[PDB]
Amino acid sequence: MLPGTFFEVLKNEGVVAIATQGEDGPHLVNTWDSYLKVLDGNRIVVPVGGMHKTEANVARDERVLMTLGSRKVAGRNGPGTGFLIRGSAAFRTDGPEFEAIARFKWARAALVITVVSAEQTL
Amino acid sequence: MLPGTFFEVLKNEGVVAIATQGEDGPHLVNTWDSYLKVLDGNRIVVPVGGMHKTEANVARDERVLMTLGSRKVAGRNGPGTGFLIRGSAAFRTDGPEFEAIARFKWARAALVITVVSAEQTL
Ligand SMILES: Cc1cc2nc3c(=O)[nH]c(=O)nc-3n(C[C@H](O)[C@H](O)[C@H](O)COP(=O)(O)O)c2cc1C
Ligand SMILES: Cc1cc2nc3c(=O)[nH]c(=O)nc-3n(C[C@H](O)[C@H](O)[C@H](O)COP(=O)(O)O)c2cc1C
């Protein structure tokens, strides 16, 4: 379901933001555009070094939001676009989903986001 | 309280993410590094075109989170850094905080974030 324009954004560097639901409000962490590995079946994989609070939140509520964008990709009304991604998160520590990001020697896990919707917001 | 390194990030284009507490989980929206207007008294101002869900959330819970970063600014262990900003939000349609972003003629409002903490997370 992830559209072509989303893959165009991924070709460009940028800050990715990942929101979770915590006990006393939202939490928000980051990765890089270039770190994302997209697999078939609508899966975005993120290398996890920290994300301990994020992981605790996902354990309680699997639903996450992700945003990313680039000034270098054309939006609907001018240069620059981005996306709001909604999906369910899981943390993997073995198997193909972990191997997808195992190149990162600091990785303790793979954050796997199964995408339910992708909206171009610009 | 906002540190020099944060202002170095703002010299570079990038995607800013703003998380709020929604009715059924977090909400997450964006602006650009170059749109942020920093005022005395630890205030960050964002031009508001949409942000209708965000405004509804802020009306009920003023606490917000913001992230931003850049590969072009050195972090602690290599190239690239970014920030987690925590603060309280208000929406303004007049006064000096609105005038700060009034040059954006599509702006219906100014989102004013009064910063309580700024953490360099990389
Ligand atoms: C631009 C940027 C990229 C980041 N990339 C990662 C990353 O790929 N993996 C990771 O675990 N943390 C990364 N971090 C740090 C996380 O955003 C977060 O601060 C840290 O993992 C702690 O997560 P937690 O608050 O859920 O415990 C990055 C931070 C920034 C500013
Ligand atoms: C890179 C990027 C920059 C954006 N800049 C703004 C902005 O400056 N002001 C704004 O109102 N919306 C901006 N948007 C759209 C918002 O993220 C959001 O989708 C829209 O304001 C609707 O907000 P809401 O879901 O809270 O109703 C931007 C989106 C992207 C991807």
Swiss-Prot record, chains A, B:
GO cellular component: cytoplasm
Family annotation (InterPro entries): Pyridox_Oxase_N, Split_barrel_FMN-bd
Primary location: cytoplasm
Obligatory cofactor(s): FMN
Keyword Zinc part of the UniProt annotation: no
Keywords: Cytoplasm, Electron transport, Flavoprotein, FMN, Transport
Cell compartments where the protein resides: Cytoplasm
Electron transport in keyword set: yes
UniProt function note: Functions as a redox protein with a potential of -325 mV.
Subunit details: Monomer and homodimer.
Protein name: FMN-binding protein
